[PDB]
Each structure stands twice: as C-alpha cells, then as structure tokens.
Amino acid sequence: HLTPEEKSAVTALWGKVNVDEVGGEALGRLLVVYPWTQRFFESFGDLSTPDAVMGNPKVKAHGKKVLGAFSDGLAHLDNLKGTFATLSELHCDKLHVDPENFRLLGNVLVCVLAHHFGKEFTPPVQAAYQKVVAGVANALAH
Amino acid sequence: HLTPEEKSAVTALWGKVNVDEVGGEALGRLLVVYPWTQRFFESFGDLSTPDAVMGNPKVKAHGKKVLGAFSDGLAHLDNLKGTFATLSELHCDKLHVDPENFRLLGNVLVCVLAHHFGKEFTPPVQAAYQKVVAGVANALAH
Amino acid sequence: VLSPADKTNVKAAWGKVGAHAGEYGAEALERMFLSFPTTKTYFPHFDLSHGSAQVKGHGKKVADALTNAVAHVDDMPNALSALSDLHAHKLRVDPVNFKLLSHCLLVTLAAHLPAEFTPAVHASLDKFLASVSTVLTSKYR
Amino acid sequence: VLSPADKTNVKAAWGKVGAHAGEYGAEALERMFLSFPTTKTYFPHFDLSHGSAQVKGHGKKVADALTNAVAHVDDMPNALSALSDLHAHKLRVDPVNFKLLSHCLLVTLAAHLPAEFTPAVHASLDKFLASVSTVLTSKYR
Ligand code: HEM
Ligand code: HEM
Ligand code: HEM
Ligand code: HEM
C-alpha cells in the first residue's frame, strides 16, 4: 500500500515527533472538537473547557499510550491487523466505540503533525500519513 | 452471525418478495432520497422527478440485477466475501462508489420490505435483515 | 436545509400519524434496541424488555417532541433547545446513534402507513429527521 | 448549528488568513487530490499537475467563496444559493467529498498559521466548514 519512498518519508518525520506530547495534543483535540467522545473518558476528571481538557494529566498520559500504539503500527506497516487485534477487541467488546471515531482520531493526528512540522509537512508527506491512519482505523474496527 | 431461527425468518419472508419489482423500488428510492447517487446512472435517461425515476425502465431493470445479487448473498450467508468479490472490484476500480452508499442502499431495501410486508415485518424480522444488509455492504467495500 | 416542499410533505405525513404517534415512537425505539444493541448503553437503568411500560412512556416523549419539531420547522434550534442541551451537553450521544433511531422511525412509518410512504414523502421525512438530529447533537446558544 | 463563540472564532481566524486565502485554497485542493485521488473524477477536464494554473485559479474561487460564507455566517443558505445549485443539482457531489476538502483545508491552516490554530479555533473552524458543506450538498429553495 505504501511505496518504499513514502514508507521512508513517514519514518523520517516520525523520528522527530515528541512522543511525550503529540499523543496528548491529539487526544485533547479529539475531546474538544468532537465533544461526544468525552463520554468515554468520564473517569479522567475535569473536561469542562478546552483549557481543562488540554491540561488534564490523565489525557496527557493516555495520549502517550495511544501514540505508543501508532508507533507500533508504523513499525509493522504490513501486519497492521495482527498488530491491533487485542486493541480491536477492547475498543468494541468492552468500550463500544463506534468505528467512525477511529477515523476522526487519525485525522486529528494529521492536523497535529501539520501544526508542529509546518512547511515540512508537504502534500506528499500528508498523503503517506493518510494511508497510515486509515490503515490503523481499519485494523481497529471490529 | 445469524442464529438458525433468524436465518429461517429471513428465508421465509424472502420467498414472498416480488423479484421483478422490489429491486427497482429500492434503486428508485435510493435515487430520490439521496440525489447525488444519480451521478452514477447518468446513462439511464430521465431521472428528473420522483415520478420519472420510479417509472424509468432502466432503473427497473438494473434493480432486478441488484436484487438478484442480494438473493445470491442470502443463499451463501457464510462466504459473503467470496460471493461479492467481483462486484467489489467493479464498484471500486471502475465505478468509484464510496462505501457509505452501500449502507444507504441496504437501509432503503429494509424500508421497502417494511412497506410491502407491513405488520409481518416484525422487530425481530427487521433485525435479522439488518445483519444481512450490513454483511452485503461489508463484502462490497474494497 | 429543507425545501418548501419538504416542509409541506412532512407536515402532512406526520399529520396522518396523529394519535398513534406514541405507539409508533415506542415501536421505533424497540426496533432500534433489537437491531442495534449498542444503543441500549444509553439507557442502563431502564427495563428494555418487550412491552416494557418505560419504553412505551419514552416513545410517547420522543413522538411528542417530533410533533413540536414539525410545528416549528422554520425555527427548530429555538424549539429544540432544551433537548439539545440534554442530548449534546449532558448525555453526549454519539451522532451515529441519531441515524439509527431515524432509520427505525422510517421503517415504523413504512410498515404502518404504506399509502403515505411515497418516494417523495420518504425523501422529505429523511431530510427532516436529519435536521432534527443535527440540532440535537450540537452544542450551541 | 454554530454557537456565538464559534462565529467570533471563525471571523477572527479567517481574518488572519487575509490575502493568502487564494494560496491556501490552492494548497488545500492539491492536498485533497494527492491524498484522496477519487476526488479527481469531478475535475476531468483540468490540468491537475503540481503548480497547475487552473488549480491555482480554482483555489482562489473556493477561498473567495469561504470569505463570503464568513461575512454571512448568520444567513448562509441565502448567500451560498448559487453554489448550492452548482454542487447539489448540477455536479451532484457525493457529501463524503466535502469532508475530505474540509480536512485538507484544516491541515493547510494548521501548517501555515500554527499560533492561531488553537484547540478552540480548530473546533470552531471544523463546525463552520461542516455548516458550509451542508448548505452546498442540499437541494432546497
Ligand atoms: C484510533 C487509534 C486508537 C488507538 C491507536 C488507541 C489505542 C488505545 C490504547 C493503546 C489504549 C490503552 C489500552 C491498554 O492500555 O490496555 C486504549 C484505551 C482506550 N481507548 Fe483507545 N485508541 C484509539 C482510538 C480511540 C477512540 C477513537 C476512542 C474513543 C472515542 C478510544 C477510547 C479508549 C478508551 C475509553 C480506552 C480505555 C481508557 C481507559 O483505560 O480508561 N480510543 N486505546
Ligand atoms: C449495496 C448492494 C449493491 C449490489 C448488491 C449491487 C449489485 C450490482 C450489480 C449486480 C451490478 C451489475 C453488475 C453486472 O451486471 O456485471 C451493479 C452495477 C452497478 N452498480 Fe451496483 N450494487 C450495489 C450498490 C450500488 C450502489 C450503492 C451504487 C451507486 C450509488 C451502485 C452503482 C452501480 C453502477 C453504476 C453499476 C453499473 C451500472 C451499469 O451497468 O450502467 N451500486 N451493481
Ligand atoms: C429524534 C431523535 C430524538 C428525539 C426527538 C428524542 C427526544 C427525547 C426526549 C423528548 C427525551 C426526554 C427528555 C425529558 O424527559 O425531558 C429524551 C431523553 C433521552 N434520550 Fe432522546 N431523543 C432522540 C434521540 C435519542 C437517541 C438517538 C438516543 C440514544 C441512542 C437518545 C437517548 C436518550 C436518553 C438516554 C434520554 C434520557 C432518558 C432517561 O434517562 O429517562 N435519544 N429524548
Ligand atoms: C467548501 C467547499 C467548497 C467550496 C466553497 C467550493 C466553491 C466552489 C466555487 C466557488 C466554484 C466555482 C463556481 C464558479 O466558478 O462559478 C466551484 C466549482 C466546482 N467545485 Fe466546488 N467548492 C467546494 C467543495 C467542492 C468539492 C468537495 C468538490 C468535489 C470534490 C467540488 C467540485 C467542484 C467542481 C467540479 C466545480 C466545477 C469547476 C469547473 O468545472 O470549472 N467543490 N466550487
């Protein structure tokens, strides 16, 4: 699905992602932009304002876990279904997350990379990442 | 996916479908209710009013073909992917049909069966058919 | 956005529903719970069994709300404001679920009023229910 | 439906776009064609190559239309009426494609105006672009 020169483009820009921060920024933005996703993180405390969500420590910490998982997918870009199987069970059987939301999180992640890299997130770089996030959303949907 | 008593419910009501007419009624309704689907049937002539669409002979005739295919799926409710493979290629590679539209056609078909059977299209019968049409939509999406 | 013909259509089909609105609203809910069981998670404290009096009372409330959306089809955000606060701010209903209830309602009307469920009416009812859905999923003021 | 704060946000972010609106509108189109190649089927008679002057002229038209949607954020169906007739009656654009262009536009703005693309603004821009999309996909009067 990804050409050798678009697998390489993806890895190069990913080696520059702050893994402590980007994951939180994405999960944060999901909860602000699509406010019904807050229903699934009811235990995380105060999610009452954009400021509250973005500074909530448990959002920051869960976003590290989610980004951890995308990085796992980026190491195994062939065998994404096998990478994400356990996580598909969890998001369905136990959480009941509608799969459209998986697509929304991938798109929000694309915007956060745009926002951090600026000019260097070129149209061809974006297109390689759109293939990557669609892959992860499909692997997760049960 | 379908219990033995919901496979049987599905077959019983399907043995009573007018196969010359229901397929057309469904394809007709798709073109009226979701008017952008008309873009894909531009060769079928006049689709300008609900009356025109519903009486168009080429809509009636294509709807027989589509219903033919659902009946093929209802005979092979295990191996739906293998039943619909050639049709998935055609709808993607050649037609470029977004897969959300496959879901819309299945739902319209459910409403046409409701409309024809009335009281006998009970909630449990509807639920068995919702499993059947989701199956067909998934098998078609590439 | 609704056309003027959409509005005439919906006003006249829903006018024919009349005093079965409660009974249809209950049946639509029961279809939704059977056909899409994940929607039961929003109703954890309800008896959801067949013939439940709590589902039949909830179907009357849903139907009576749709009757008022029809009477205020030109100013729906204002007429549906408290409902919007309940579903979008308090319950946080995922918008996917409004497409499920809407479909179940269309199916209920097709089964009960076949002579009214023409293609044109079907099209106008579907657009009305999507406009109601959008008001209820939005946090606005 | 937009909140009053949504409207202030969009008016102020799009005000900062200013005279790059044309350049951003072209870049968003080029992102959409590369990342979602099926959208090229609506533009069969265009040079769609990188740096095409026809894509750059089309991006100016799209951007100038968004500028007018912002100036008429309270009465968009009326301000966007001819566009609605072009996209819904004549071109019959599948609504899925409006979600693709909208995403590409957000991505373009994130890359160019990072200091303005706060979470609150991101949320208000996304709701505005969905409201524009809904007007353009609807056959109404
Ligand atoms: C799209 C990519 C996504 C990935 C890669 C992802 C990954 C993860 C991971 C790694 C966990 C932790 C599992 C564990 O620690 O055992 C998790 C838990 C969870 N995810 Fe996701 N997730 C994604 C999307 C979503 C979305 C869209 C939602 C909700 C809208 C969601 C809601 C949750 C919830 C509620 C949990 C449990 C959190 C908790 O422990 O309290 N996820 N996910
Ligand atoms: C969801 C179930 C569907 C099934 C079972 C189905 C089945 C078929 C079949 C059997 C054919 C004829 C193929 C042949 O004769 O070789 C066909 C062709 C076609 N289908 Fe579908 N289809 C479905 C959905 C759709 C949808 C949603 C669209 C468009 C919105 C669509 C557009 C077409 C078109 C354009 C053709 C070619 C028609 C022509 O020959 O001019 N189909 N489909
Ligand atoms: C046209 C769509 C809908 C309408 C007109 C509607 C209308 C209503 C009304 C009138 C109430 C009662 C408010 C009150 O008693 O003051 C209500 C409550 C509720 N609705 Fe909806 N509703 C719709 C869609 C949905 C959907 C899709 C869901 C979930 C799948 C949902 C879940 C609920 C819940 C959980 C309550 C709270 C009921 C309770 O705890 O007693 N509604 N709705
Ligand atoms: C915010 C979303 C959009 C806006 C503001 C927009 C605006 C416009 C404008 C201003 C025009 C030119 C009309 C004229 O020259 O009189 C136009 C034409 C067109 N648009 Fe869009 N558009 C949008 C989304 C889309 C999407 C998603 C598609 C397809 C994927 C699309 C396909 C076209 C096509 C094919 C034309 C005809 C261009 C030509 O043949 O010269 N538009 N649009």
Task: Tell which residue, C4, C36, C6, C5, has the closest CA to residue C130.
Answer: C6
Task: Tell which residue, C133, C108, C136, has the closest CA to residue C122.
Answer: C108
Q: Which residues, including other chains, have CB under 8 Å from residue C78's CB and lie 6 or more apart?
A: C72
- Region for residue C94 given its phi and psi (left: phi exceeds 0; alpha: psi -120 to 50; beta: otherwise): beta
| Owning domain of residue A116 | 1-142
Q: Locate breaks in chain A with C to N over 2.5 A; list the residue preceding each.
A: none
Is the distance from CB of D66 to CB of D21 less than 8 angstroms? Answer: yes
Is the distance from CB of C110 to CB of B114 less than 8 angstroms? Answer: yes
D58 min Cα distance to partner chain B (Å): 22
* Domain parsing of chain C, residue ranges: 2-139
Q: Looking at residue B19, which CATH number applies to its domain?
A: 1.10.490.10
Q: For residue D44, count other CB atoms closer than 10 A to its CB.
A: 7
* Ligand having the closest approach to the CA of D130: 4
- Cβ contact (<8 Å) for C93 and A98? no
Q: Using alpha carbons only, give the angle A44, A50, A56 rounded to the nearest 5 degrees.
A: 30
Six-digit token pair at D57?
């002229």
Query: Could you say which DSSP state residue B15 is in?
Result: T
* Ligand having the closest approach to the CA of A107: 1
Query: Residue B82 burial (CB < 10 Å; 0-12/13-18/19+)?
Result: exposed
| Helix pair angle (D119-137, A22-33), 10° resolution | 50
- Cβ contact (<8 Å) for D134 and C1? yes
CA D41 to chain centroid, in Å, comes to 18
Q: For residue B20, count other CB atoms closer than 10 A to its CB.
A: 12
Spatial separation of the C-alpha atoms in residues A63 and A67, rounded to whole Å: 6
Consult the annotation and say whether A81 binds a ligand: yes
Q: CA–CA distance from A118 to each of A52, A113, A122, D22, D108 (Å)?
A: 26, 8, 8, 18, 9
Phi, psi (rounded to 5 degrees) for B87? -65, -30
Q: Which of C91, C92, C94 sits opposite A98 (nearest CB)?
A: C94
Is the distance from CB of D36 to CB of A130 less than 8 angstroms? Answer: yes
Give C119 Cα–ligand 2 centroid separation in angstroms: 20
Q: CA–CA distance from C55 to each of B135, C20, C62, C65 (Å)?
A: 29, 15, 10, 15
Residue of D31, D32, D38, D102 to mutate, testing the A interface (most A Cβ within 10 Å of its Cβ): D31
Is the distance from CB of D17 to CB of D109 less than 8 angstroms? Answer: yes
Q: For residue A78, count other CB atoms closer than 10 A to its CB.
A: 11
Given CB atoms, is A114 within the 8 Å cutoff of chain D?
yes
- Pocket flag, ligand 4, residue D109 (CB < 6 Å): no
Q: Tokens 């005000």 sit at which residue?
A: D15
Taking CA–CA distances from C111, the nearest residue in chain B reads B118
* Ligand having the closest approach to the CA of B31: 2
Q: Find the DSSP H helices in chain C.
A: 4-17, 21-35, 53-71, 76-79, 81-84, 96-112, 119-137
Spatial separation of the C-alpha atoms in residues D98 and A109, rounded to whole Å: 19
Q: DSSP assignment of chain D, as one string?
A: ---HHHHHHHHHHHHHHGGGHHHHHHHHHHHHHHH-GGGGGG-TTS--STT-HHHHHHHHHHHHHHHHHHHTTTSHHHHTHHHHIIIIIIS---THHHHHHHHHHHHHHHHH-TTT--HHHHHHHHHHHHHHHHHHH----
Provide the domain count of chain B.
1
Is the distance from CB of C112 to CB of B118 less than 8 angstroms? Answer: yes
Spatial separation of the C-alpha atoms in residues A14 and C70, rounded to whole Å: 52
Q: Which residues of D touch C77 (CB under 8 A)?
A: 1
Q: Using alpha carbons only, give the angle D74, D76, D77 rounded to the nearest 5 degrees.
A: 130
Q: Which residues, including other chains, have CB under 8 Å from residue D72's CB and lie 6 or more apart?
A: D78, D79, D80
Task: Tell which residue, D58, D34, D51, has the closest CA to residue A123.
Answer: D34
| Helix pair angle (A57-75, A4-14), 10° resolution | 150
Specify the CATH superfamily of domain D2-139.
Globins (1.10.490.10)
Q: Which residues of B touch D95 (CB under 8 A)?
A: 36
Q: CA–CA distance from B51 to each of C21, C115, D85 (Å)?
A: 29, 16, 21
Six-digit token pair at D42?
């609506």
Q: What is the largest CA-CA distance in chain A?
A: 44
Spatial separation of the C-alpha atoms in residues B67 and B62, rounded to whole Å: 9
Q: Find the DSSP H helices in chain A.
A: 4-14, 22-33, 50-55, 57-75, 80-83, 85-89, 100-117, 123-140
Q: CA–CA distance from D70 to each of C109, D13, D85 (Å)?
A: 39, 10, 19
Residue of C43, C85, C94, C134 to mutate, testing the A interface (most A Cβ within 10 Å of its Cβ): C94
- Cβ contact (<8 Å) for C94 and A35? no
D23 min Cα distance to partner chain C (Å): 31
- Cβ contact (<8 Å) for A36 and C95? yes
Task: Tell which residue, B31, B23, B118, has the closest CA to residue B71.
Answer: B23
Resolution of the deposited coordinates, in angstroms? 2.3
Q: Tokens 């394809």 sit at which residue?
A: B27
Spatial separation of the C-alpha atoms in residues B52 and C34, rounded to whole Å: 36
Experimental method: cryo-EM
Q: Which amino acid is at B46?
A: D
Is the distance from CB of B1 to CB of B84 less than 8 angstroms? Answer: no
- Pocket flag, ligand 4, residue D42 (CB < 6 Å): yes
Query: Could you say which DSSP state residue A79 is in?
Result: -
Taking CA–CA distances from B109, the nearest residue in chain C reads C107
